[PDB]
Amino acid sequence: IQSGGPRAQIGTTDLHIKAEKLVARFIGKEDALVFSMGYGTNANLFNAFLDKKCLVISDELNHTSIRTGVRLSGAAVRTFKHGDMVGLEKLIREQIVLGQPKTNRPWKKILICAEGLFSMEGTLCNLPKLVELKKKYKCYLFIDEAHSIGAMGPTGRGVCEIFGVDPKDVDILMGTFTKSFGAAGGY
Amino acid sequence: IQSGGPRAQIGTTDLHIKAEKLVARFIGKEDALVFSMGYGTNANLFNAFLDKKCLVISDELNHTSIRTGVRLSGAAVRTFKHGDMVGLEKLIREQIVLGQPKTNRPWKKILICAEGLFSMEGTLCNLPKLVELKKKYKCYLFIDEAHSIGAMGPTGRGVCEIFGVDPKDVDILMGTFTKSFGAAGGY
Lengths: 187, 187
Description:
This is part of a larger assembly, with two copies of chain A (about 190 residues). The longest helix of chain A has 14 residues, at about 15-25. The first copy, chain A, is built from eight helices and five strands. The two termini of chain A are about 20 Å apart. The first copy, chain A, has a five-stranded parallel β-sheet, covered by helices on one side. In chain A, about 35% of the residues lie in helices and about 15% in strands. The first copy, chain A, has helices at about 5-10, 15-25, 40-45, 65-75, 85-100, 125-135, 160, 180, and strands at about 55-60, 75-80, 110-115, 140-145, 170-175. Chains A, B: LCB1 and LCB2 encode essential subunits of the enzyme and form a heterodimer. Component of the SPOTS complex, at least composed of LCB1/2 (LCB1 and/or LCB2), ORM1/2 (ORM1 and/or ORM2), SAC1 and TSC3. Interacts with LCB1 and TSC3.
């Protein structure tokens, strides 16, 4: 029941490797990492590939861990109404035109954050339209499948299975094993 | 008394080479070209290294050939009062901040055009201050020595000699042989 240390020092075993391979095969992607806490995963993720010159467009009903992870990095944030896609397109166009505040230089990066199933409304995210806009305006997509993975779809693969979307147009997927698998951690 | 054709096809002789070397040695620079008309020189110069994304800051009393050469390329133009350097510094700072019109992206290039001696006032250009601002704000300098070369200075080298400025901080110099040398052409 004891671990040695961080995964980069002595912490890795063969079980971690097997779990990563199995998760990657299950989802439909190429590689994966597993962490010991979902909240920690969201909190410490965005800090790695975002700065104060990038921008994040997020739905107004996202989780708190995403908000803390965005706040720790320093990026700018704008939000759109829940379930409105015309507002999302208008906001994307206006923010590409305007540029960084006080300087109007081009945004170094743009990232769109959504949630597979919002666990206060029961509604889903319009994944096809998000992928369409993502393709058109050269943005990026980040999906949080905590309440979706394992429990929804014809075979339980999430929202990509539900919408028949190829799970390749979604840049980053993450979730937790706590909700439908009776365990702890995230990926 | 006859020429063959353009300099790039059959037009070059050894006399052109000797004249170019002699002019380059006389001025204090490394290389030079000679053209058959000063007006044509100014008209067709700027078209080679300027586009619609660069900017030109020129004095309000420049010659007409410079204006036509700038108009043919497509660059933007702003002017400053004659003999005012605080206005020049303020304009440089504001135009670096603002950026390209309608888009506010950074100016791809900035060029400052002046004249060694304005042949309607008899006044000189404040070359030391221009070189100072040029060094500080990373601009470029273009000087038109038509009435200055050959006729002014302790030995007749122009305004660089008058102001003891090293003729290396001035990016491009041009002039004519018509005014003080009793000939035709430009360099």
